[PDB]
Amino acid sequence: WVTVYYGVPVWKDAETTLFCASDHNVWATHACVPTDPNPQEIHLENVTEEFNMWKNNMVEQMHTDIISLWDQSLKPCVKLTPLCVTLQCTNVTNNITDDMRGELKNCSFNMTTELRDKKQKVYSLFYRLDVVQINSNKEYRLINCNTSAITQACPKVSFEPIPIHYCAPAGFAILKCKDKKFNGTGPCPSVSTVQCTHGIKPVVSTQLLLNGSLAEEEVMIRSENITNNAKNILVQFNTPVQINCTRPNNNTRKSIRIGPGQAFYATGDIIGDIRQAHCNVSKATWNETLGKVVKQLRKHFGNNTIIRFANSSGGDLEVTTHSFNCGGEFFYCNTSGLFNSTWIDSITLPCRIKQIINMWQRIGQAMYAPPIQGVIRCVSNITGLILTRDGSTTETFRPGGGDMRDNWRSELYKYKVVKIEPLGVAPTRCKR
Amino acid sequence: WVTVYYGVPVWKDAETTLFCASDHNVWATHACVPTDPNPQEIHLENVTEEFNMWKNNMVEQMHTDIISLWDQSLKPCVKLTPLCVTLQCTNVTNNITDDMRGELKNCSFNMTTELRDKKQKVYSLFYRLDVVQINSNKEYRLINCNTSAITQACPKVSFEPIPIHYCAPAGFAILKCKDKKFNGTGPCPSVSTVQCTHGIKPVVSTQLLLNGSLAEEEVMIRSENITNNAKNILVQFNTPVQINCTRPNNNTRKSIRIGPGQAFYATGDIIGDIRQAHCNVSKATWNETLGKVVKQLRKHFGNNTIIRFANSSGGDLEVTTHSFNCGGEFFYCNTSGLFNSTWIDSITLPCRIKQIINMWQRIGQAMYAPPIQGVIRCVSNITGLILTRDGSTTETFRPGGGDMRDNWRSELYKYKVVKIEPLGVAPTRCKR
Amino acid sequence: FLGFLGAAGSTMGAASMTLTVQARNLLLTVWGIKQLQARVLAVERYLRDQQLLGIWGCSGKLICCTNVPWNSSWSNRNLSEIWDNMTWLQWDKEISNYTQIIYGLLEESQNQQEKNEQDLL
Amino acid sequence: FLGFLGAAGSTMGAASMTLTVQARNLLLTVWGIKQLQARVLAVERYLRDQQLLGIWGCSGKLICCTNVPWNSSWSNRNLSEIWDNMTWLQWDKEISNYTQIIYGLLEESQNQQEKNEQDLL
Amino acid sequence: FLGFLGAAGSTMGAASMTLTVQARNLLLTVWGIKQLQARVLAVERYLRDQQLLGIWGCSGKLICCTNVPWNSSWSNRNLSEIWDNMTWLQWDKEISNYTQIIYGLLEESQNQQEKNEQDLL
Ligand SMILES: *[C@@H]1O[C@H](CO)[C@@H](O[C@@H]2O[C@H](CO)[C@@H](O)[C@H](O)[C@H]2NC(C)=O)[C@H](O)[C@H]1NC(C)=O
Ligand SMILES: *[C@@H]1O[C@H](CO)[C@@H](O[C@@H]2O[C@H](CO)[C@@H](O)[C@H](O)[C@H]2NC(C)=O)[C@H](O)[C@H]1NC(C)=O
Ligand SMILES: *[C@@H]1O[C@H](CO)[C@@H](O[C@@H]2O[C@H](CO)[C@@H](O)[C@H](O)[C@H]2NC(C)=O)[C@H](O)[C@H]1NC(C)=O
Ligand SMILES: *[C@@H]1O[C@H](CO)[C@@H](O[C@@H]2O[C@H](CO)[C@@H](O)[C@H](O)[C@H]2NC(C)=O)[C@H](O)[C@H]1NC(C)=O
Ligand SMILES: *[C@@H]1O[C@H](CO)[C@@H](O[C@@H]2O[C@H](CO)[C@@H](O)[C@H](O)[C@H]2NC(C)=O)[C@H](O)[C@H]1NC(C)=O
Ligand SMILES: *[C@@H]1O[C@H](CO)[C@@H](O[C@@H]2O[C@H](CO)[C@@H](O)[C@H](O)[C@H]2NC(C)=O)[C@H](O)[C@H]1NC(C)=O
Ligand SMILES: *[C@@H]1O[C@H](CO)[C@@H](O)[C@H](O)[C@H]1NC(C)=O
Ligand SMILES: *[C@@H]1O[C@H](CO)[C@@H](O)[C@H](O)[C@H]1NC(C)=O
Ligand SMILES: *[C@@H]1O[C@H](CO)[C@@H](O)[C@H](O)[C@H]1NC(C)=O
Ligand SMILES: *[C@@H]1O[C@H](CO)[C@@H](O)[C@H](O)[C@H]1NC(C)=O
Ligand SMILES: *[C@@H]1O[C@H](CO)[C@@H](O)[C@H](O)[C@H]1NC(C)=O
Ligand SMILES: *[C@@H]1O[C@H](CO)[C@@H](O)[C@H](O)[C@H]1NC(C)=O
Ligand SMILES: *[C@@H]1O[C@H](CO)[C@@H](O)[C@H](O)[C@H]1NC(C)=O
Ligand SMILES: *[C@@H]1O[C@H](CO)[C@@H](O)[C@H](O)[C@H]1NC(C)=O
Ligand SMILES: *[C@@H]1O[C@H](CO)[C@@H](O)[C@H](O)[C@H]1NC(C)=O
Ligand SMILES: *[C@@H]1O[C@H](CO)[C@@H](O)[C@H](O)[C@H]1NC(C)=O
Ligand SMILES: *[C@@H]1O[C@H](CO)[C@@H](O)[C@H](O)[C@H]1NC(C)=O
C-alpha cells in the first residue's frame, strides 16, 4: 500500500541565501547575475498561504547586502587623514541671502603636498554642519576628528539606486501575494510563484519613502501592531506626490594633491550668489493625499476621532529631518511644513546640506562626499510615509524613520521564501 | 561469483581538513559550527587499530588554525607606529619593595594628537623588559623598534581559551583510543568511533601544561624515542596540581588619543604599593606528584638509577621560564624552585610581566597587550610537564617547551582520522 | 500546461502527473562564497533524496510501488478522499508525524527483499 | 542495534546487513573556502562510486550479484572462511592487489551484456 | 585501445563501444573560488544529465532502448548510413534542431509507461 512519489508540489517556510540579479555603481555592479529578459510567474490556483511581512528574513538579507556593498565600494578610495588639521575659518559673506547667513565657512589650512618635505596653504569651503569651533575664535576642526577616520568617496562611483532583483536558489521558491488590500499579515488567496522579485531600488531615506511602488487601489496602513505606540506605521500611497528638490548654487570643484597619487576634492568658490537649498511639494496634491491617509487611519482609530499631524520630535539631524541623497549630495530637509494640520502654489521645505556623512547608525566609519559642480535639480515621487503615533479623543501622528529596514520592508512585503520538499508517500492500491 | 557490496565497514589512514565546532574570542567566535548537544560514540568490538601520536596530522592542523585565527583577530586593531619614539625615562621609586627595584620605568614622550598639527606630552609606565636603553642616560626606545611593527590588541577581545571540538567531514571518521595506559604508539584494542573530539582548550604555555586532561590511572611518560636525548618527554599527571598566580598591583588605565578614532591604552599610576607578581604551588602536592613521575621514569631508565631534576638551561625568556597568559596579562615565571631535587606551606615562584609580546616563534609581528585595571588572580591546574633529558648512573631532567605543537599533541594523542572506503567485492555463490 | 508548482492547489490524483515539473527545478570574494554555499547545498539536498530512494529500492523512478502495507492508524481514510479531495500540502500535514516510521519500514523491507533475491540466484 | 562502523570487527557475513548504516554517513573567507572544499570533495567522492556501480550494472543496489567468475588465484579460500571467519578489513587487505583486475572484468562483462540485450529487442 | 575521445573520428557503430571511456572523464582566496566554481559546475552538469536519463527511464544505462518511434522527418536515412558512414559529430549537427522535440517525446512516453505499470500492480 505505501507508494513513494518524488516531485510532489509541497513546501515549507524556510530561510536561505538569495542571490542578486540585474538588467560604477555603489551596489550592484559586476558582482550580480544578469537577469532573465522573460521571467516567469505562475498563478497557483486554490492556494492560500500565510504571509508575515514583519518576520520576513528577506529584509534582513537586503539590509546586510547593501551595507556590505557600500563598504566594499569605499574601501579602495582616498583616505583623508591629512585633512584633520586645525582650520582657520571666516564667514562666506559675498552676496549671501539671509537664509544662508552663517551657513558657509571659508577655511584655510596647511595641507600635505606630494613631497614629504613640503606643505601647501590651501583653502576650501565647508558647511557649518561639517565643522566644530574649538578654543582663536576662528579655529575649527572637522566634526569627525574626535570620533573617526574619514575617507573620500571615489568621484566615479555614482549613488544612483539602480534596481536589484532577488532570486531564489534551486530547491527554493519565492511566493508572491497578489491579493490587493493585503495588510502584511495573515493568509491570502491569489498567490503566485515567481523566479525573482521585481526590481527594488535601494533608495535611502527617512520620513518620506521615495521612488517606490504604489498601492493598487487604496492608501494602505500597515503596522506590526496598530495599537502599540512603540511600533511604526507604514503608509503606502495609491498615487505619487511629486517633489522637486534643488541646490541653486553654481559650485566649482578644485583638486588638491595630498600625496603621491592622491587628491582631495574641495569646494572652490561659488559662482553667482548664495541661496538656500530647498524642496517643493505641490500643496493641493499633498492635501488630497493626506485626505486619503486620514480616511484610512480612521478605520483603526474611530471616525469620530480627531487625527492630528505634527512635526517630528527632537533627535539628531538624521532623524528629525527628511534625509535623502540626490544628485550625489546629501540633503536634510525640514518637513514641518508638511505635517502641520488637524485632520487635513506649493509648499517649500528648506534644506541643509552636509559633506561629512555617517551612514546608517554606525560610528567609526565616516565618509566625505566630494562636491558636485554646477547646479543640482531632482524630481522624485513620494510613494509613502513612515509615521509614529504619539499617545483620549485625539491621536497625533509624527514622521519617523532612521531604521533602514523599514524602507525595504515596504517593497518586500509581498514576498515569501519557501523550501521545496519533493518526497512524499501515500496509500495506493498496488504492490511491488 | 563476484558480488559487489556497497556500504562495507572498511577504512584507511587519511589526512583531511577537519572543521571546528563549539558550544569576543580570539579563536573560535562565529566562524565555528554549533555543536551537537548529544554527540555520538560507538564502541567497535574486536577492532585493533594502530595509532601514532607523533605523526598525527591533526596536530599540524590545530597549530595552523590557531595561528591563523590569532592573526585575523589583530588585523583590524590599532597600529601603534606613533609610539616608536624616543622615550625619557626615570625609575618608579614610590613605595617599591626590593624585588621590584628597577622593574618599572616612568617614561614621557611626544605623542601624536587627533590633529596633525599638534603633539601632546604624555607619559606611561613600562616594564623594564619592554624597553631598551639607547645612547642621554635616560633615553629609551621600545624593544621592537628595530625589528617590527607593533599593534595593540583590541581590549574587547578576550584571550580565554574557550574549547574547540574538531569534527570530521562526511566520508571520514575519527577513531578514539580508549585503552588506558596507551603510550602513544602501536596498536590498541578498545577503539571507538566519534563524531568529534572532546573540547580542547587552546591553552598556550611552556614547561608546565595547564588546564588539560588527566591520565585515568597512572602518571604517563610519552616520547617519540625515549632513548633519544634530542626528543622531548611529555608527562601526563593522573591528578592535578593546583597553582595560584597573581599580580598584586592595583593598576589604572588611561586612554591616549593618537589619531582620528584611535587610542593607545597606557598604564597609568599604580594605586597602593608595588609588589612582585608570583605563583604559589602547594609544596606537599608537588612533592607527591614528582614522586609519581620518577616512579614511572624508572621503568625506562632503571630502578637503581639516580634521577635528578634541574632547572632550565639558558635561552630567551620565552624558553627558560614558564610562560602563560592569565587574566589578560603575560607572565614569565621562574620554575627553578620546582625543579631542584635528587629523586624527589607552598613554593613561591617569582614572575615577570611583559606588555610587548612576540607570539610563537615569529619575528616581524609584535603585539602590545593593553594593561588590565585592578588586581589579577588566577587559579589553574597543572596537568603535565614537558621534560628534556640531559645526557652513567644518573640522568638529569630539565623543563622544556617553546614548540606549541607539543601542547596539542598531549590532547590529540587519542585521535586518528580515517577515510571510509564503502566498496568491496567478495566471492559469493550466485550469478546474475 | 501548468509550470512549477502550478498543481499545488490541485488534488493529489490530479497532481502527480506533474512530477517531472518539480523534479527538474531542483537541479567580492564574500559574494563568491555565499553563492558557492547555496549551490553546494542544492546539490547535497538533491543527493540525499536520491540516496534515500535508492535504499528503498526506488532508484530512477518518480512513482515507486513498494511492498509495505499501510497502517490504518497513520491515516484512516479511503482512496476517494485521499486522491480526489485532498491536496499534497494537506496530506503532508496530516501524516507528518508518521514519516519517520514509514521511512524505517521502507528501508527494512528493501533489505529483506535484496537478500531474498540473492539467495534465489 | 549497531551504529556507524559498529560492525567493523564482525565477520563479513554478520556485517553486510548494516550496509545502509555506512552508506548514509557518506552524504574569514579562508574558513569558508576550506569548508567548501571539504564539502565539494565529499560529493565528488560519492559520485565516483555511484558512477562506477552504474557502469558495472549495479546502479541502485547495495548488494549486486554479477556475471564474472572468481579466479581462485585472487583468493583460494572457501565461503566458510570468507564469510564466517574474516572481517571486511582483513579481506580488503588480502585482495588489495587484485582490485583493479576485478574492476576491469566487471566493466567488460557489463558492456557485453548491455549490447546483447539490445540485439534481443 | 583508444583513450578519451579517441573514437571521435570513428563511425557511430565503431564508437559506442567506448562509452565508458568518455563517461569516466566527466567526473589567494580568489584562486580558491575560481576552482571551486569549476568543480561545482562539473558536478551540476553531470547531475543534470543523470536526472534527464532518469525521467526518460534510462537510469543506470549507457545504452537505453526506448519506446518512441523515429520520425523520418528528423533524418531520412537508413541504418547503414547512420551507423556505418557517419561519425557522432556529424550526426549531432544533422539533428540538432530536433533535439528538444525528441526529448519531450521521451519524457512523455515514460510518464505513460510509469503509470501503466502502476495500474498493473
Ligand atoms: C575665501 O578666503 C580666500 C583667502 O583665504 C579668498 O581668496 C582670496 O580672495 C581675494 C579677493 O581679492 C584674492 O585677492 C586672493 O588672491 C584670494 N586668495 C587666494 C588664495 O586665492 C576667497 O575668495 C574666499 N572665498 C569666499 C567664498 O569668500
Ligand atoms: C523647521 O521649520 C520650522 C518653520 O519653518 C522651524 O520652526 C521654528 O522653530 C523655532 C524653534 O523654537 C520656533 O521658535 C519658531 O516659531 C518655529 N517657526 C514656526 C513657523 O513654527 C523649525 O525649527 C525648523 N526645524 C529644523 C529642524 O530646522
Ligand atoms: C512617479 O509615478 C508615476 C506613476 O507610477 C511614474 O510614471 C509612470 O512611469 C511608467 C514607467 O514606464 C510609465 O509607463 C507610466 O505611463 C508613467 N505614468 C505616467 C502618468 O506618466 C513616474 O515615472 C514616477 N516618477 C519617478 C520619478 O519615478
Ligand atoms: C611619572 O612621571 C610623571 C611626570 O612625568 C609624574 O607625574 C607628576 O607627579 C607630580 C607629583 O607631585 C605631579 O605634581 C605632576 O603634576 C605629575 N605630572 C603629570 C603630568 O601628571 C608621575 O607621578 C610619575 N609616576 C610614577 C609612578 O612615579
Ligand atoms: C630563578 O630564581 C633563582 C633563585 O630563586 C635564581 O637563581 C640565582 O641565579 C644567580 C645567577 O648566577 C645565582 O648566582 C644565584 O645563586 C641563584 N640563586 C639560587 C638560590 O640558586 C635564577 O637566576 C632565577 N632565574 C631567572 C631566569 O630569573
Ligand atoms: C582541576 O582538576 C579537577 C579535577 O579534574 C577539576 O575539578 C572537577 O571539575 C569537574 C567539572 O565538571 C567536576 O565535575 C569535578 O567534580 C571536579 N572535581 C572536583 C574534585 O571538584 C577542576 O575544576 C580543575 N580546575 C580547573 C581550574 O580547571
Ligand atoms: C555680487 O554679484 C555681482 C554680480 O556681478 C558681483 O559684481 C558682486 O561683486 C557680487 N558681490 C560680491 C561681494 O562679490
Ligand atoms: C558668521 O555669521 C554668524 C551668523 O550668526 C555670526 O554669528 C558670526 O559671528 C559670523 N562670523 C564672522 C567671522 O563674521
Ligand atoms: C601654516 O603653517 C605656518 C607655519 O608657521 C603657520 O604660521 C600658519 O598659520 C599655518 N596656516 C594655517 C592656515 O594654519
Ligand atoms: C491585517 O489583517 C489581519 C487578518 O486577520 C488582521 O488580523 C490584522 O490585525 C490586520 N492588521 C492590522 C494592522 O489591522
Ligand atoms: C499590541 O499592543 C498592545 C498594546 O498594549 C498589546 O497589549 C497587545 O498584546 C499587542 N498585540 C500583540 C499580538 O502582542
Ligand atoms: C516639478 O518640475 C516639473 C517640471 O515640469 C513641474 O511640472 C512640476 O509641477 C514641479 N513640481 C513642483 C511641486 O513644483
Ligand atoms: C485640505 O483639505 C481640507 C479639508 O477640510 C480643507 O479644509 C483645506 O483647506 C485643504 N487645504 C488646502 C491647501 O487645500
Ligand atoms: C465608522 O464608519 C463605519 C462604516 O460602516 C460605521 O459602521 C462605524 O460605526 C463608524 N464609526 C463611528 C464612530 O461613527
Ligand atoms: C516642531 O514644531 C515645533 C513648533 O514649536 C518646534 O519647536 C520643533 O522644534 C519642531 N520640530 C523640529 C524637529 O523642528
Ligand atoms: C502650522 O499652521 C499654522 C496655522 O496658522 C501656521 O501659522 C504655522 O506657521 C504652520 N507651521 C509651519 C511649520 O508651517
Ligand atoms: C556655472 O558657471 C560656469 C562658468 O563658466 C557656467 O559655464 C555654467 O553654465 C554655470 N552653471 C549654471 C547652472 O549656471
Ligand SMILES: *[C@@H]1O[C@H](CO)[C@@H](O)[C@H](O)[C@H]1NC(C)=O
Ligand atoms: C633605577 O634602578 C636601577 C636598579 O639597579 C638602578 O641601577 C638605576 O640607576 C636606577 N635609575 C635611576 C634613574 O635612578
Ligand SMILES: *[C@@H]1O[C@H](CO)[C@@H](O)[C@H](O)[C@H]1NC(C)=O
Ligand atoms: C617633546 O618635543 C619638545 C620640542 O622641543 C622637546 O623639547 C621635548 O623634550 C620633547 N619631549 C620628550 C619627552 O621627548
Ligand SMILES: *[C@@H]1O[C@H](CO)[C@@H](O)[C@H](O)[C@H]1NC(C)=O
Ligand atoms: C609504547 O608501546 C609500544 C608497544 O610496542 C612500545 O614499542 C614503545 O617503545 C612504547 N613507547 C615507549 C616510549 O616506550
Ligand SMILES: *[C@@H]1O[C@H](CO)[C@@H](O)[C@H](O)[C@H]1NC(C)=O
Ligand atoms: C632511538 O634513539 C636512539 C639514540 O641513538 C637511536 O639509536 C634509535 O635508532 C632511535 N630509534 C629509532 C626507532 O629511530
Ligand SMILES: *[C@@H]1O[C@H](CO)[C@@H](O)[C@H](O)[C@H]1NC(C)=O
Ligand atoms: C589557591 O586558592 C585556593 C582558594 O580557596 C586555596 O584553597 C588554595 O590552597 C590555593 N592554592 C595554593 C597553592 O595556595
Ligand SMILES: *[C@@H]1O[C@H](CO)[C@@H](O)[C@H](O)[C@H]1NC(C)=O
Ligand atoms: C619529598 O619526598 C621525599 C622522598 O624521600 C622526601 O624525602 C622529601 O622531604 C619530600 N619533600 C617534601 C617537601 O615533603
Ligand SMILES: *[C@@H]1O[C@H](CO)[C@@H](O)[C@H](O)[C@H]1NC(C)=O
Ligand atoms: C626494577 O623493578 C622490576 C619489577 O619487577 C624488576 O624486575 C627489575 O629487575 C628492577 N630493576 C632493578 C635495577 O632492580
Ligand SMILES: *[C@@H]1O[C@H](CO)[C@@H](O)[C@H](O)[C@H]1NC(C)=O
Ligand atoms: C638554573 O640554576 C642555576 C644555579 O646556579 C642558575 O645559574 C641558572 O641560571 C638557572 N637557570 C635559569 C634559567 O635560571
Ligand SMILES: *[C@@H]1O[C@H](CO)[C@@H](O)[C@H](O)[C@H]1NC(C)=O
Ligand atoms: C635547591 O635546593 C637547595 C638545597 O639546600 C637550596 O639551597 C636551593 O636554594 C634550591 N634552589 C632553588 C632555586 O630553590
Ligand SMILES: *[C@@H]1O[C@H](CO)[C@@H](O)[C@H](O)[C@H]1NC(C)=O
Ligand atoms: C583599586 O583602586 C580603586 C580606587 O577607587 C579601588 O576602588 C579598587 O577597589 C582598588 N582595587 C583593589 C583590588 O584594591
Ligand SMILES: *[C@@H]1O[C@H](CO)[C@@H](O)[C@H](O)[C@H]1NC(C)=O
Ligand atoms: C481549483 O478549485 C476548483 C474547484 O472546483 C477546481 O475546479 C480547479 O481545477 C482547481 N484548480 C486546479 C489547478 O485544479
Ligand SMILES: *[C@@H]1O[C@H](CO)[C@@H](O)[C@H](O)[C@H]1NC(C)=O
Ligand atoms: C499499526 O500501528 C499501531 C500503532 O500506531 C501498531 O501497534 C500496529 O501493530 C500497527 N499495525 C501493523 C500491522 O504493524
Ligand SMILES: *[C@@H]1O[C@H](CO)[C@@H](O)[C@H](O)[C@H]1NC(C)=O
Ligand atoms: C471529494 O471529491 C468528490 C468528487 O466528485 C466530491 O463529490 C466530494 O464532495 C468531495 N468531498 C469533499 C469532502 O470535498
Ligand SMILES: *[C@@H]1O[C@H](CO)[C@@H](O)[C@H](O)[C@H]1NC(C)=O
Ligand atoms: C503530530 O504531533 C503534534 C504535536 O503536538 C500533534 O499535535 C499532532 O496532532 C500530531 N499529528 C497527528 C496526525 O497525530
Ligand SMILES: *[C@@H]1O[C@H](CO)[C@@H](O)[C@H](O)[C@H]1NC(C)=O
Ligand atoms: C567480537 O568477537 C566475539 C568472539 O566470539 C564475538 O562473539 C562478538 O560478536 C564480536 N563482536 C561483534 C560486533 O560481533
Ligand SMILES: *[C@@H]1O[C@H](CO)[C@@H](O)[C@H](O)[C@H]1NC(C)=O
Ligand atoms: C586466473 O588468473 C591467472 C593469473 O593470476 C590467469 O592466468 C588465469 O587465466 C585466470 N583464470 C581465468 C579463468 O581467467
